[PDB]
Design a binder for this molecule. Structure first.
Ligand code: HEM
Length: 154
């Protein structure tokens, strides 16, 4: 798949807003994922112990990892489809080291869309959400293909 330039512009316009507060958005997205799909929390030996939303919100470590996640995702999105080098090390660590099944990438995709819709309603109308979804689908498709190449499947 290929996004058009107009779709990329909708994606990067809302992303510019996200980047005004990377830590806050990172926290919100990981917490949404762990509340909506509790099984994902189990893959994080670092965070597995957190029992409640209050505890997640107070963890400086979780916030730091949220920044790490969104910074890496932001770098991929800014490539506007030319992301093969950025994707390679991420595919390898998530497939071989962390052992994350590809279905969980769908779950975090959902979490990102939820938080952008909640925080940025005026810059995340239906057309902008559709463009963000296509971007995330492109990312998932390419990561799935690399999983296969690496011997995992997802
Ligand atoms: C937008 C998708 C994602 C991005 C951009 C992302 C990015 C990253 C980055 C940059 C790291 C640190 C370096 C590395 O280990 O590769 C990391 C670590 C990790 N990721 Fe992801 N990740 C994503 C989705 C997920 C999902 C869906 C899960 C699990 C449900 C996951 C599980 C982990 C784990 C367990 C670690 C190691 C944490 C630690 O113990 O420090 N990732 N991720």
């Amino acid at each position: 798949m290929v996004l058009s330039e107009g779709e990329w512009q909708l994606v990067l316009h809302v992303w510019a807003k996200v980047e005004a507060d990377v830590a806050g958005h990172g926290q919100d997205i990981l917490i949404r994922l762990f509340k909506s799909h509790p099984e994902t929390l189990e893959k994080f030996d670092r965070f597995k112990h957190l029992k409640t939303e209050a505890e997640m919100k107070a963890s400086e470590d979780l916030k730091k990892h949220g920044v790490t996640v969104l910074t890496a995702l932001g770098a991929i999105l800014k490539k506007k489809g030319h992301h093969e080098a950025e994707l390679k090390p991420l595919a390898q660590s998530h497939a071989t080291k962390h052992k994350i099944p590809i279905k969980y990438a769908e779950f975090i995709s959902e979490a990102i869309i939820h938080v952008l819709h909640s925080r940025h309603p005026g810059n995340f109308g239906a057309d902008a959400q559709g463009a963000m979804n296509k971007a995330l689908e492109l990312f998932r498709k390419d990561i799935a293909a690399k999983y296969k190449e690496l011997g995992y499947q997802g």
